[PDB]
Curated annotation (Swiss-Prot), chains D, W:
Function statement: Component of the type III secretion system (T3SS), also called injectisome, which is used to inject bacterial effector proteins into eukaryotic host cells. Forms a ring-shaped multimeric structure with an apparent central pore in the outer membrane.
Family in the record: Belongs to the bacterial secretin family. T3SS SctC subfamily.
Subunit structure, interactors included: The core secretion machinery of the T3SS is composed of approximately 20 different proteins, including cytoplasmic components, a base, an export apparatus and a needle. This subunit is part of the base, which anchors the injectisome in the bacterial cell envelope. Forms a stable homooligomeric complex. The complex is composed of 15 subunits.
Organism encoding this protein: Salmonella typhimurium (strain LT2 / SGSC1412 / ATCC 700720)
Disrupted gene: phenotype observed: Insertion mutants are hypoinvasive in the HEp-2 cell assay.
Protein name: SPI-1 type 3 secretion system secretin
From-to range in the entire protein, with total length: 95 to 170 of 562
Localization in the cell: Cell outer membrane
Gene: sctC1
From Swiss-Prot, chain F:
Entry GO CC: plasma membrane
Location(s) in or outside the cell: Cell membrane
UniProt keywords, alphabetically: Cell membrane, Membrane, Transmembrane, Transmembrane helix, Virulence
Described purpose of this protein according to its UniProt entry: Involved in a secretory pathway responsible for the surface presentation of determinants needed for the entry of Salmonella species into mammalian cells.
Family: Belongs to the FliP/MopC/SpaP family.
GO biological process: bacterial-type flagellum assembly; bacterial-type flagellum-dependent swarming motility; protein secretion
Protein name: Surface presentation of antigens protein SpaP
Segments passing through the bilayer: 6-26, 53-73
Swiss-Prot record, chains G, M:
Organism from which the protein derives: Salmonella typhimurium (strain LT2 / SGSC1412 / ATCC 700720)
Key words, A-Z: Protein transport, Transport, Virulence
Role description: Required for invasion of epithelial cells.
Iron-sulfur in keyword set: no
Protein origin, superkingdom: Bacteria
One of the GO biological process terms: protein transport
Name this polypeptide is given: Protein PrgJ
Keyword Transport: yes
SS bonds (residue pairs): none
From Swiss-Prot, chains H, J, N, P, S:
Source species: Salmonella typhimurium (strain LT2 / SGSC1412 / ATCC 700720)
Consequence the record notes for mutating D49A: Shows a specific deficiency in the secretion of the translocase SipB/SctE. Shows fully assembled needle complexes, but has a reduced number of needle filaments. Is drastically affected in its ability to enter into host cells
Result of changing F58A: Abrogates host cell invasion and effector secretion
Protein name (Swiss-Prot/TrEMBL): SPI-1 type 3 secretion system needle filament protein
UniProt GO BP: protein secretion by the type III secretion system
Phenotype of null mutants: The null mutant strain is non-invasive.
Full protein stretch here: 22 to 80 of 80
Molecular function (Gene Ontology), one example: identical protein binding
Listed result of changing L35A: Exhibits constitutive secretion of substrates. Does not display SipD/SctA at the tip of the needle filament. Is non-invasive. Can polymerize into filaments in vitro
UniProt family annotation: Belongs to the SctF family.
Length: 87, 73, 127, 76, 88, 73, 89, 59, 48, 59, 48, 54, 89, 59, 39, 59, 88, 57, 59, 78, 43, 78, 76
């Protein structure tokens, strides 16, 4: 019974990179920014939106494991601010 | 694992649980022989060492796993 | 022993307000934004950066007096059996900082404030 | 006290009452008279052959009478 | 004897909830019949006077004790993992 | 039976993030920040109380939905 | 051995909200007050404490009181914390 | 219902506290009730402890 | 009112049963109450 | 009022420590007071600990 | 029907198996039941 | 003060209950067996409350 | 060992809420000082602690002393915590 | 001052370890000092615990 | 079981620390972009 | 590799559960393995807790 | 033998910082001796046997512990008040 | 230094309280109970402090 | 230096495990070292715990 | 290596303090059981079993006192 | 090597010193419980 | 037979405390993998100290790094 | 003290009272006259053949008399 804990545990790791991709669109959009949205239910929305759109299957292990993590965050933020300035 | 530390005592002796029953079958058959009292006291006193060395090793292994599980949190 | 750790931890907590008020950082960060308002620009060069260049400069010159605080206090000769010499010992430890504030503060304002050698607690607004 | 002169203001005088078990007041007054720590201005108030007495004086005289009185009953 | 199904092929699921609901129903029925199958073992007198049956029931008590606490801290850590992300 | 309590407490811990996402509290909170912003007032009317007045209407509507869960479970 | 049960629960539509919570509060306070007496006069009665037949029941009721009030304590704490996380912002 | 046949064998030993077969059967009853009673007390205790541990974990 | 308890009752089964007849009489009567006394000390520990 | 008939049975065995019926009744008294006192001690303790658990939860 | 556990069955093996004969027949009998007593009294403390 | 307590009262109750049993063997054996027994009872029934204080 | 009770609980007018709190503080500090000196004089008399009947009494005075000051501590803590959230706003 | 009358009864039993009345009074003394010492140990502990609870609550 | 629980004892805890580490870096990651866009 | 030489001494007592020297050496083995196992469990626990404290400080 | 020092020394203060600094030295000298005298009571193994000198060494821990815990949390509040007013 | 604790002082009191009881049994219920209560009392003194060292923390 | 005279008294009892005065003195030694070791363990533990409480307060 | 610990130190310290008690009670069991009525043989083995029971309980309860202190340390680890 | 205990020595004083077999067989069980209860007072 | 041998400041500080926590991690690691050292009490006590100052060390440089970087943000937002 | 000259100010004089058990004051004074540390300006005040006395002087003289008295009485 170890895989049941591991299935939610691979998910909560996968949603962090999903947050890092889609978080700077919720700053850019005029009907979604912090001026129109509060603090308490904002971070509930941004996680489950990336959970409903994440491309790889959830029960599988993510390929993030110790490749290069601090520059990976600056990749996903740079493409996030790119998608923000296009949208 | 916990069945196997119990079953090593049922495997390590062959048929002692039946050897005590056929012994007390002879004891209830003819309860007047000195070699039968001495053989019964030699076969009966091995059983309480056997089962209390069966239940105490699983008792000490129980709290060892209880020390393992509580240090998760 | 355990009074030294709560005193150092209190210094680490109070450290932003001491560098915000007590040291020479206020001479830097004021006159940096004075040039920006002299030129007439409002958000250029975006004073978050200009506070950075004022901080590395003020830390660069405050650090030699800070290095004196180690070599007086990391030694093992602190065991004084009478509590007043130990008090004057840690009086003489901060003596370089007190001498620096005396070098850069006006004289008569300090004695007006300790009217209420001078106390470090009194000259601090006068600096 | 034979070696120095102590001076306090009037609002510092201390009081103390102490009961000895195995020594008398007249035997303790001999320890103050022979050793030279006797003081005629602030004497010891009490019955001469008893254990309970009352002292009042400077804070170096009171602490000496109490600490030198409670240190004789551990020896006798 | 006992049964093992050999092919645990990953039946791909539309969300993780049907998996969680089947794991919860797979184990609630497990622990419900365990809580009976050791209690009725205690409640019959012929089961408890035999030392041979008695250390077997000692064993199943130690299994049932170690099981629910192994599910307990595993889900408390799973909830603790998901709230630190969702809090923000 | 015992782990039904684990499922209850684990549902209990994740409750206010469900109120953060699933219910209609998200309709009241946004329009109440918007009526503050359109008037030009920045700090007033002190949105800690505006969360409370927006919460009480959403509970006032959500109560018949959540009440049938208790009697069913 | 004396028992009694009432079967039909009172149920209707009240658009009023606080009185249902008042009935929940009084229904829990009375049921936790009758049992603290029932366990206490079982323990101060010196006939019930000596019987091994009655003692098996006596260990049960102290556990039923123990698990009940601890359950309400943890449910309410998560309840008042859930409203706290939304209003504190 | 073990306590019934506990409470039914003591009185005949009360009328005859010298029958050798009866005290053997009476001791075989009363020690067996000793084995039953602590079994029920020890078995309810774990069911309390594991039920208290979950709320101890989640509090 | 003198209160009676269960240990009185089990000793009341023994006291009404009546020299070696009288001194093997205190033989088993000592055994039964001392063995009945410890059976609840574990359970009365087992509240906590 | 249990302590009264506790304190009333010790004196007749003190005045006559060789009656076989009296020490049987005296032991039958003292073990029941033994069962009563720790029962009261164990029962106040749970009412204290569960009262401490609420403030432990809400603090 | 009276419920007969394993220790009732071993006393039934003593009774259904059939002065200095009959007393030592009890002498071996009064100790073997205490032996069967404390062996199962050894498992019971190890539950908790 | 020379303080006497309840265990001194119950242990002297064995001695002062009889007239001259301490000066005048099977009687004195069981009389010690009950005197030594009742103080083992009384030292336990309070010590359970002693560990039950905190 | 011979006791006395006083039956008059006087009433003085409060002139403010500050005048009310000084009475509530002085009325509670006396009760917490007296009960702790009661339990010390109960302990320091050694003939009281050797009797079985007085021990559950001292157990009761212990558990009340613990529950009283813990209930006033958590309540004043949540009170000033209620002040801090409003002042932060 | 309990330790004085503790330290005065052990030596007469040391000089005569066969007097039956003395070991009865000595055991009645030493178990009573046993009841006193853990009572003082358990009672200072709660006064520590509740004083530590205030700074744990207010920190 | 003493060696299997021990190797699963590390195996749960290090992966729990890894998921908290990857989530704290994402929070400081996008929060640095938020403050740099406010500049 | 401690569990190997633990698991090599149980079988000779299984074949002979009456040797006095063997159960003395077996207890001398098993209590030392009891001291080893919880020591490793308690020592990995601090290395987890202090590793959790850094992210608790910096979050 | 025993020896006490009757004369306590004092010095004049003129400012406000030295009044804090003599409390700083008085607490560092209080904790430096009380960390040591209970360890010397533990290291002398005749002092660890008698229950009388065990009970006085029991309460000397609680005197040390409540004192240092009190001066920690008072300073935590004292710097918290300088923290909040300057944050505003 | 040759060190002796208070427990050793108790056990030594059974050595200095006797005069020739250690010699005359070589030269019996007296030696039975004199060694019985010696071990029982040093067991009590072993136990009475052990609750207090736990009550340290 | 307590461990020296610990390690010097077990061997004469090892050579003679039937002397009544010696094993009495050996138990009087070894139980006293038992009282010493957990006392040292409990006393270093509080000096760790209150030192950990300061960083717990100031973090 | 066949490894030894401190508890194996104290147990084999008892086993090196004694020299031949594991076989000398077998030789008195050889002697007394040959003719089981001799008064110089009844007390011979009865003097061998007495030191065997004292020595085997002494090697046993020492183990528990040297166990529980090391239990108290590891309980004081966290 | 002939190993000796002091329970081997009290047998040696009985050799080097039907009632002889009743005095020794009782005093050897005197030590058998006195030196057993002392080491049972360890735990 | 026993033997013995004898022998930017932030960039040396982080390197100095880098292996200072590694060798103290490893010396209690092979202290606990050696089973002879975990059974002796006076070796257990010095390992108990060795754990406790290890905890105080990395907690002190933890919080002092946290307040060190804690002093820069407030001045930089200003 | 025969090797150097210590100089303090007058407000640093400390004093103490000690009690000896198995060593007299006349023997301790014959030790101070034998060693050379006897100072006639700050003598010892007490009874000439008793056990308790009073001392006052500089802080290097008082800590010397105390540390040699409580280490001489323990040896005898």
């Amino acid at each position: 019974f170890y895989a049941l804990y591991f299935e939610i545990h691979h998910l909560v790791a996968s949603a962090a990179l999903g947050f890092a991709r889609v978080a700077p669109i919720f700053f850019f959009l005029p009907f979604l920014n912090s001026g129109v949205l509060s603090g308490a239910p904002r971070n509930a929305i941004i996680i489950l939106v990336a959970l409903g759109v994440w491309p790889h299957a959830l029960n599988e292990a993510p390929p993030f494991l110790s490749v290069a993590m601090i520059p990976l965050v600056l990749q996903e933020a740079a493409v996030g601010v790119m998608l923000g300035c296009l949208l | 694992y916990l069945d196997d530390v119990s079953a090593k005592f049922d495997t390590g002796v062959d048929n002692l649980q039946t050897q005590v029953t056929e012994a007390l079958d002879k004891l209830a058959a003819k309860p007047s022989d000195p070699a039968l009292l001495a053989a019964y006291q030699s076969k009966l006193s091995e059983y309480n060492l056997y089962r209390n060395a069966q239940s105490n090793t699983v008792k000490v292994f129980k709290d060892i796993d209880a020390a393992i599980i509580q240090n998760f949190r | 022993n355990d009074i030294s750790l709560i005193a150092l931890l209190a210094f680490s907590t109070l450290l932003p307000f001491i560098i915000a008020s007590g040291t020479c950082f206020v001479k830097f960060s004021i006159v940096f934004v004075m040039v920006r308002n002299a030129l007439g620009l409002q958000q250029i060069p975006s004073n978050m950066t200009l506070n950075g260049v004022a901080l590395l400069l003020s830390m660069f010159v405050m650090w030699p007096i800070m290095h004196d605080a180690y070599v007086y206090f990391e030694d093992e000769d602190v065991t004084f059996n009478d509590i007043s010499s130990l008090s004057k010992h840690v009086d003489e430890g901060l003596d370089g900082y007190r001498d620096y504030l005396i070098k850069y503060s006006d004289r008569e304002l300090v004695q007006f404030f300790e009217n209420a050698k001078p106390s470090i607690f009194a000259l601090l607004p006068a600096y | 006290d034979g070696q120095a002169i102590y001076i306090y203001d009037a609002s510092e005088m201390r009081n103390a009452v102490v009961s000895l078990r195995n020594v008398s007041l007249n035997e303790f007054n001999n320890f103050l008279k022979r050793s030279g720590l006797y003081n005629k201005n602030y004497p010891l108030r009490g019955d001469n052959r008893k254990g309970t007495f009352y002292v009042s004086g400077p804070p170096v005289y009171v602490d000496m009478v109490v600490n030198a009185a409670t240190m004789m009953d551990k020896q006798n | 004897g006992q049964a093992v199904n050999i092919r645990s092929m990953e039946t791909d699921i539309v969300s993780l909830d049907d998996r969680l609901l089947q794991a919860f129903s797979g184990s609630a029925i497990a622990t419900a019949v365990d809580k009976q199958t050791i209690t009725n073992r205690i409640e019959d007198p012929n089961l408890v006077t035999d030392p041979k049956e008695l250390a077997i029931s000692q064993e199943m008590i130690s299994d049932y004790n170690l099981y629910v606490s192994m599910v307990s801290t595993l889900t408390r850590k799973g909830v603790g993992a998901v709230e630190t992300l969702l809090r923000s």
